[PDB]
Ligand binder design. Structure first.
Ligand code: HEM
Ligand code: HEM
Lengths: 353, 353
């Protein structure tokens, strides 16, 4: 069978898999492929936060501004827009942009129209919350998994195409084995999530730096093309358990090592919901994410259902992308956001270490 | 922390674990310890099978006769007695013996009083079924896991003592990592379970050989010293889900790679039940056992509950031992057993290969 690891990224092993070579997965799954040209991607999550109804027009307008900024030279190759309400009652609009290289994202982010907007004093006077959570995993530092072959969402949309059926899935620990770097590296977490400028308690501008091997999961659900019966199976039998799991991580993050958990719903440019959703989960380690997925009743509750429906699962599209990053490849920046927003919640303030 | 792998069995690695070095288990577990004098053990499961109530006196006498032979020179260091009814409605008395070396067991089975009994014409005329399922894993080819420290049952009883709290548990794949041979060997199954003499369809004497890396699990439950409330917890909450899982493996073996599944209850020399039970499961590969344990609803259910009750578990005793064997280190013998008994069910017949 094909390997999840791109051919050019395969190397002599110092670390090995947990399954013998005779292993065959019990159902088909696929991964994103890209050739040697793709060395490091950028995933830029750009947010707008508000709580009061009277702020919605401005918030939607700001989102429209960000989206228009993407049509400028060196904008992302792909993007999508989502909405969610956090556990503080704040509505969050997030535009996720995907770039195929670090330098293009850097040229874009520092270009006059983009940088002037971000650095403007008007960002403080808007009354809105703004955030940029921008992370840049190397090709060896992310994995993808799709229960379908076409029209790849997220980072798969900027990769070169789709694989054949892959070997490394269907067992706990398979995710890790899909990271090309797992051939040689433990992806061990070290360091702390640190505030390097500002104070979450004061609001205004706050800058948080990530630590080595924070993991980010985007795990998605797409029921936009499902027929009535499959819609009901997802909405009545799968979603409740997924929602329970997302609520848990959202409200018990520090206990399990989840710095931030968002369960978001895709929207159009005007804020109308689309029938796609995903988790955006930032984790203190890859192994903590492994521990939760393989042992918590919620994900286990969630998980067997897929194994049952996989055979006939007909139009529901499920997938995830998981990434790890060097400390230097993560930037989490906040303007006038509540102190529980994203990486503000668990970050250690200038005195807390 | 202490390793599950005995000091003398630790070697330069070629295969690695699936957790980073910083891993710490969420609750304490312990393992059997033995020094380099324990190179290879023999596990001998000796059975008497019957269905008609009128056969019970003769069956119990047979079991007593077998146990008496255990008291002879080179008899096993430890033994215990169990009863179960199989899915064909036959009652099975099984005495399991553990020897600390291969040569003692061979000397025992070739000794006249033992050899003349097994080769006797009385075995065919008795009307009872008899079996011998004898396997001999090296110290590197079995692992133990105990949720307690005192009074080890099964193979732990022939080992030297108990370890401290061990690192290698609390995650899927931890069983594999407790096998000392996992430092170097995949324990990949090859070959087939095969009849080398006789025919299961006709009864009489049938002899079956195993293949490379057949796995044997003994997973046990001991509630003898639990007080009323904790007894209720096991009998009302844990046991029904355990029973469900055992029924599944008993009746759906071929589909999951389980050659034989028995859920047995300990008995005294007279046939009276004791408050201890275990699974005896023979599997086509260690990895098939891994897959079932980490994915099947029933095991995932009881897994759930142990993690929640582990902090307050006081008298309930849960453990397992799992072994893998070289092809040559197994022998499965049957006299007048029904054709679904143990290895008889899935063995390739002489007319088939
Ligand atoms: C209701 C939607 C979901 C379903 C049906 C589901 C089901 C599954 C299935 C079947 C697998 C095994 C994939 C394979 O290798 O074949 C898996 C793996 C995984 N899931 Fe989910 N999942 C869902 C949502 C999520 C979410 C929101 C998270 C966020 C924490 C998550 C985290 C994980 C992780 C980290 C793995 C990797 C397990 C490993 O290989 O070690 N899942 N999920
Ligand atoms: C009262 C009954 C049982 C309970 C409460 C239970 C619970 C658990 C728990 C909590 C673990 C993880 C242990 C650790 O590493 O800390 C485990 C592992 C395991 N159990 Fe059970 N179990 C039971 C019976 C059984 C039976 C009858 C089987 C036979 C198929 C079985 C097969 C396994 C296997 C193969 C593992 C190793 C998983 C791995 O490390 O890859 N269990 N069980």
């Amino acid at each position: 069978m094909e390997s999840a690891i791109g051919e050019h990224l395969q190397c002599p092993r110092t670390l090995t898999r947990r399954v013998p070579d005779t292993y065959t997965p019990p159902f088909p799954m696929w991964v994103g492929r890209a050739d040697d040209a793709l060395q490091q991607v950028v995933m830029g999550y750009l947010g707008v936060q508000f709580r009061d109804e009277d702020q919605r027009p401005a918030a939607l307008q700001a989102m429209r501004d960000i989206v228009a900024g993407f049509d400028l030279p060196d904008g992302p190759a792909h993007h999508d827009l989502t909405h969610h309400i956090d556990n503080q009652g704040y509505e969050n609009l997030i535009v996720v942009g995907y770039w195929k290289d670090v330098s293009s994202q850097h040229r874009w982010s520092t270009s006059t129209p983009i940088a002037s907007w971000w650095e403007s004093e008007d960002r403080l006077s808007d009354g809105l919350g703004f955030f940029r959570e921008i992370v840049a995993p190397r090709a060896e530092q992310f994995e993808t998994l799709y229960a379908f072959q076409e029209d790849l969402p997220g980072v798969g949309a900027v990769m070169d195409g789709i694989s054949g059926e892959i070997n490394e899935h269907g067992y706990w620990g398979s995710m890790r084995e899909r990271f090309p770097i797992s051939q040689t590296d433990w992806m061990q977490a070290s360091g702390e999530l640190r505030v390097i400028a500002g104070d979450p308690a004061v609001g205004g501008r706050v800058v948080v730096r990530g630590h080595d091997n924070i993991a980010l999961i985007r795990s998605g659900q797409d029921w936009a093309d499902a027929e009535a019966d499959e819609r009901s199976l997802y909405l009545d039998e799968i979603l409740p358990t997924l929602q329970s799991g997302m609520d848990f991580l959202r409200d018990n993050g520090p206990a399990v090592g989840c710095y931030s958990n968002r369960f978001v719903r895709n929207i159009d440019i005007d804020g109308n919901f689309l029938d796609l959703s995903y988790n955006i989960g930032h984790w203190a380690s890859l192994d903590q994410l492994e521990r939760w997925s393989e042992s918590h009743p919620t994900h286990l509750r969630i998980f067997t259902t897929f194994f049952r429906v996989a055979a006939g699962l007909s139009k529901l599209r499920l997938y995830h992308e998981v990434s790890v990053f060097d400390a230097a490849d993560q930037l989490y920046e906040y303007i006038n956001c509540h102190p529980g927003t994203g990486m503000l919640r668990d970050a250690v303030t200038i005195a807390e270490h």
